[PDB]
Scaffold this active site. Structure first.
Site, mmCIF file in Angstrom:
data_model
loop_
_atom_site.group_PDB
_atom_site.id
_atom_site.type_symbol
_atom_site.label_atom_id
_atom_site.label_comp_id
_atom_site.label_asym_id
_atom_site.label_seq_id
_atom_site.Cartn_x
_atom_site.Cartn_y
_atom_site.Cartn_z
ATOM 1 N N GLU A 137 1.809 3.321 10.825
ATOM 2 C CA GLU A 137 2.526 2.558 9.836
ATOM 3 C C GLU A 137 3.643 1.856 10.507
ATOM 4 O O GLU A 137 4.162 2.329 11.515
ATOM 5 N N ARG A 138 4.103 0.747 9.878
ATOM 6 C CA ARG A 138 5.108 -0.113 10.443
ATOM 7 C C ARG A 138 6.401 0.636 10.447
ATOM 8 O O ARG A 138 6.805 1.228 9.448
ATOM 9 N N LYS A 152 0.883 -1.139 0.000
ATOM 10 C CA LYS A 152 0.000 0.000 0.000
ATOM 11 C C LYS A 152 0.916 1.182 0.000
ATOM 12 O O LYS A 152 0.811 2.095 -0.814
#
Lengths: 187, 91, 469, 113
Positions: free
Chosen positions: C183-184, C157
């Site tokens: 978010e990671r 994404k």
């Protein structure tokens, strides 16, 4: 019939106490004794504050009640039954709540009203008196229905005054007038 | 007063700072009365050799989550603060 | 005097304070509880009356002793803005999380702000070229627009967005905001490094990008107001600096998702699929404070992590309402191996029109849609029977569409690392020609394998020679 | 032993109110003498105020709120032994094979770690 329902819960307790003792026609005595037992509850500070919160049995609760009615003889008989109800309902937390509510009902029977003339500043005594007079002159105070007038200081309404009592208010504070002035000049 | 003295007499006299005594219990979560001092997500040790993590600090009651079987815990056991947030030996 | 309080409850990260003095709280105020872990910032969200607020707590609520002193800092959390936001990655409160020390600020601005008025609105449609064939062809973006992506579960994404950042924002000179909600972290560090490397962040110089980054680790409440913080930074550029901004948001699903977590605890009976009953208002506020006004044109890019890969879920549904372009990317098209994975029958833009990208573009698009729609239609027949059993006229259409499908995969430059295939940025002018030719069947005479994962039409021709060897 | 009076019978979920401070533990087995014979209730909650919430192992029909309950003291204790081999036993651990009262060695709690 009820002296106009106060709340739904806890004031249903007060209402019941009230109407029952109203039909006993012994409300002042009841109220006074309730104040007295409330005072000795408060003036038992450890475990008359710290045993208003349940933590012990029904039977042990009952014995707390027994110590309470030992603390003074006389407490009507309706408020001695009220203690029973509260012990059975195991709720002494809303005991002072009921006391306050019974007070509201009592002073409703007296007709003694409480009002306020909130301002953002301490007000003159001449103003207190003139307004108390004015309020009595008007039919806002029933006459037979008494009045207290309390100024409170709230910076919230910047300056001005608001007279309040019943469901009738006149708000001539500066902040509110400014609100409308500003608003109308936002057009 | 003599009444007040008798009130002290019929009371357990624990002020329940750093200890509680459990109220109604079951479904592996417990509701404790007391634990006035209690850190959030602390580990508490119940008097039955089972420990739980406080989840809900609510006025008047704290809702521990029991890390262990229901059979162990019964109502009115004494809960003592482990005093530490849930930690596990590492090394 | 100090609006002290005690913490009446700590039910999850929805602490409730009980203010002592009858000095009022106000909804959306911020409170500082000083903790030996440093301060904790809470935000008043409900008034339960009788001087008991119920407060969302941004950071973790572990340790709190029920009956903890409070001080009311008053009003919503105030970020720090300036040119100094550029080249800094900031915490929700605004503290540098990249640890580039005190961010000198001129104005510190409230996280909450009102959506600019209907009168202030201004609408435009200057075709932005992305250099991605599928994007340009099917649904070109345009300046000031609100761009939309409805990527599936970890379909890169972020990767799609990264290619866009690499292309569009280095072709944009004005300010740009990167806001990454939940978010990671590791990917974020990679992004931070890549930006620094590509000089967009130049720490020695000035950066034409500013960044707000919210880790997926961070407690739900922080993630909820990460958006509002970023949104303020964008407003400062839009308004105060005036310069045309850009904005990237990933994922705005996290904004909704976080909201769904807090709502129950807050005291709300939740709507279907558990979603917050305040979903419409909250989404509404966020998306109407992002807009192109006389003050500035803010092109915004919003990414939706489709939950469970269901786009009929209420959270994706309300996103569709507030966008000017969408480019839904789905797992199926990804499985087919087509990178990018944009669905070609589920892309739309208001920026696709014959009066926008011209009659020729619109005509080209009409045919692309028709061919693909036919191709999808015959999927049943294709499976039940053989492809030879297809009608001959249709079989030509199918063969063309099979080619079109393969053609649309264009290697990306950020994907170039991962795929290994060198990236391809194909001009918009080139794209119209390339597809036009295919529609005229000019280069329909060479394998599907040739069309697969390559750039422009010319590149296909060269790749035919390569394939022929 | 602990005894208590039935204070609800909403469905087969029978709440029993037990003497002050003295209440069975969770998973204990209670026996209510009934005109039926006996009714075995198993404590699966403590509802506070020395009251429990139990489930029933036998029908609850015709209960009068107030009936005395007796606490066995733990999970149902069922006979075990080579005696029990080839004997049909119902849930309350009693013969329904009608091959007579099952001679027992030991009895053991039904919940066992």
């Amino acid at each position: 019939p009820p002296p106009v329902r106060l709340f739904g819960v806890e004031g249903t307790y007060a209402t019941a106490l009230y109407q029952a003792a109203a039909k006993n026609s012994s409300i002042d005595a009841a109220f006074q004794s309730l104040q007295k037992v409330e005072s000795t509850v408060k003036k038992n500070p450890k475990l008359g504050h710290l045993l208003l919160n349940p933590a012990l049995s029904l039977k042990d609760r009952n014995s707390v009640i027994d110590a309470i009615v030992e603390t003074h003889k006389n407490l009507d008989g309706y408020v001695v039954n009220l203690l029973k109800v509260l012990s059975e309902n195991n709720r002494l937390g809303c005991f002072e709540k009921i006391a306050s509510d019974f007070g509201v009902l009592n002073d409703a029977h007296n007709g003694l009203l409480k009002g306020t003339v909130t301002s953002a500043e301490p007000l003159d005594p001449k103003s207190f008196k003139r307004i108390e007079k004015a309020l009595s002159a008007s039919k806002l105070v029933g006459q037979g229905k008494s009045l207290k007038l309390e100024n409170v200081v709230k910076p919230e309404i910047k300056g001005g005054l608001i007279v309040e009592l019943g469901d009738k208010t006149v708000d001539l504070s500066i902040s509110t007038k400014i609100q409308k002035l500003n608003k109308v000049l936002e057009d | 007063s003599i009444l007040e003295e008798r009130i002290k007499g019929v009371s357990d006299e624990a002020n329940l700072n750093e200890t509680g005594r459990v109220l109604a219990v079951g479904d592996g979560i417990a509701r404790v009365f007391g634990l006035n001092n209690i850190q959030a997500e602390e580990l508490v040790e119940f008097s039955s050799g089972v420990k739980g993590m406080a989840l809900n600090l609510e006025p008047g009651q704290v809702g521990i989550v029991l890390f262990g079987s229901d059979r162990l815990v019964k109502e009115g056991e004494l809960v003592k603060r482990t005093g530490n947030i849930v930690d596990v030996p590492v090394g | 005097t100090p609006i002290t309080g005690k913490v009446t409850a700590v039910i999850g990260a929805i602490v409730d304070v009980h203010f002592e003095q009858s000095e009022l709280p106000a909804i959306l105020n911020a409170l500082e509880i000083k903790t030996p872990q440093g301060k904790l910032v809470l935000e008043v969200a409900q008034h339960l009356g009788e001087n008991t607020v119920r407060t969302i707590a941004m950071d973790g609520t572990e340790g709190l002793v029920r009956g903890e002193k409070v001080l009311d800092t008053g009003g919503p959390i105030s970020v720090p803005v300036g040119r100094e936001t550029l080249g800094r990655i900031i915490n929700v409160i605004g503290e540098p999380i990249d640890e580039r020390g005190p961010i000198k600020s001129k104005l510190r601005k409230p996280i909450h702000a009102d959506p600019p008025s209907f009168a202030e609105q201004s609408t435009s449609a200057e075709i932005l070229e992305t250099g991605i064939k599928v994007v340009d062809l099917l649904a070109p973006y345009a300046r000031g627009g609100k761009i939309g992506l409805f990527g599936g579960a970890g379909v890169g994404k972020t990767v799609f967005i990264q290619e866009l950042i690499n292309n569009i924002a280095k072709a944009h000179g004005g300010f740009s905001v990167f806001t990454g909600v939940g978010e990671r972290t590791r990917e974020g560090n990679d992004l931070y490094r890549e930006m620094k490397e590509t000089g967009v962040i130049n720490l020695e110089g000035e950066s034409k990008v500013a960044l707000v980054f919210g880790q997926m680790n961070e407690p739900p409440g922080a993630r909820a107001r990460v958006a509002l913080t970023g949104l303020t930074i964008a407003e400062y550029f839009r308004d105060e600096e005036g310069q045309d901004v850009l904005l990237f948001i990933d994922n705005i699903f996290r904004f909704t998702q976080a909201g769904s977590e807090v709502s129950a605890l807050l005291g709300r009976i939740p709507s279907a699929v558990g979603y917050q009953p305040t979903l419409a208002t909250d989404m509404g506020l966020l998306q109407e404070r992002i807009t192109t006004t006389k003050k500035g044109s803010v092109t915004s890019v919003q990414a939706v992590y489709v939950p469970a890969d269901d786009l009929t879920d209420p959270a994706p549904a309300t996103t569709f309402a507030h966008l000017d372009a969408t480019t839904v990317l789905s797992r199926g098209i990804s499985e087919l191996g087509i990178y990018p994975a944009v669905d070609p029958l589920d892309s739309k833009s208001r920026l696709l029109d014959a009066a926008v990208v011209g009659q020729e573009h619109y005509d080209v698009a009409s045919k692309v849609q028709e061919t693909l729609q036919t191709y999808k239609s015959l999927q049943d027949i294709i499976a039940i029977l053989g492809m030879d059993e297809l009608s001959e006229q249709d079989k030509l259409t199918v063969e063309r569409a099979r080619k079109i499908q393969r053609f649309l995969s264009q290697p990306f430059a950020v994907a170039e690392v991962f795929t290994g295939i060198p990236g391809k940025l194909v001009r918009l002018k080139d794209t119209v020609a390339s597809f036009k030719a295919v529609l005229e069947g000019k280069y329909d005479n060479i394998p599907e394998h040739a069309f697969y994962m390559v750039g422009g039409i010319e590149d296909v021709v060269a790749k035919a020679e390569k394939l022929a060897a």
